[PDB]
Design a protein around this ligand. Structure first.
Ligand SMILES: C[S@@](=O)c1cc(-c2cccc(OC(F)(F)F)c2)[nH]c(=O)c1C#N
Length: 186
């Protein structure tokens, strides 16, 4: 089973990942995890971060340019992902494709049924061959550029509402991880 944990920066996705990992292993399931973007590994990720800190001329000004860099990062990992899906019962990704749809649409003031969200699907899942997650779990919290983080949170909820790329669940900060693991388990 492939699971992506999503949400805005500061939402506390890592803690969820760890909580879920323990709940799955308590239920007798092997678990592997990966975090995106892969800063310090993917040159594409690293240029993208660097660009948001004012490096690389006008790169940050294009949403699609940033989106593309983050896609190329995930694509470089596509074989690792598929490998972990064969090697372990449950594979949990801290951020995945939906992050690109949410930050891009937010940025462009578009909704989940808009162009950017559909572009991300075409590029990442169809063209680049990233496998679609079985579940996407939106960690949606009150308090994690504030304008964009709030709007990205909203777009994310919209992705979950439309079933973008697959089934979702939306959860809060105090979700019970054992209950969540039983819900997600085949
Ligand atoms: C690194 S996480 O915040 C992220 C952001 C964007 C993203 C997409 C478009 C524009 C963008 O720039 C900015 F955030 F400034 F809006 C970021 N795309 C991703 O795939 C991931 C991941 N993982």
């Amino acid at each position: 089973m492939l699971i992506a944990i999503e949400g805005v920066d500061g939402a506390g996705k890592r803690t969820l990942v760890e909580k879920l990992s323990g709940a799955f292993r308590a239920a007798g399931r092997s678990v592997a995890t990966l975090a995106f973007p892969r800063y310090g590994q993917s040159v594409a990720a690293d240029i993208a971060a660097e660009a948001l800190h004012g490096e690389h001329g006008d790169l940050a000004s294009s949403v699609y340019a940033m989106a593309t860099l983050f896609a190329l990062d995930r694509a470089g990992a596509v074989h690792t992902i598929q490998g972990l899906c064969r090697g372990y019962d449950v594979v949990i990704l801290d951020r995945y494709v939906a992050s690109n749809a949410a930050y891009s649409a937010a940025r462009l003031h578009e909704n989940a049924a808009g162009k950017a969200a559909a572009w991300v699907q075409r590029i990442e899942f169809a063209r680049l061959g990233l496998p679609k997650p079985d579940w996407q779990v939106l960690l949606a919290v009150s308090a994690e550029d504030a304008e964009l983080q709030q709007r990205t949170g909203a777009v994310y909820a919209e992705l979950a509402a439309q079933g973008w790329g697959g089934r979702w669940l939306v959860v809060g900060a105090d979700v019970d991880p054992g209950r969540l693991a039983a819900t997600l388990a085949p």
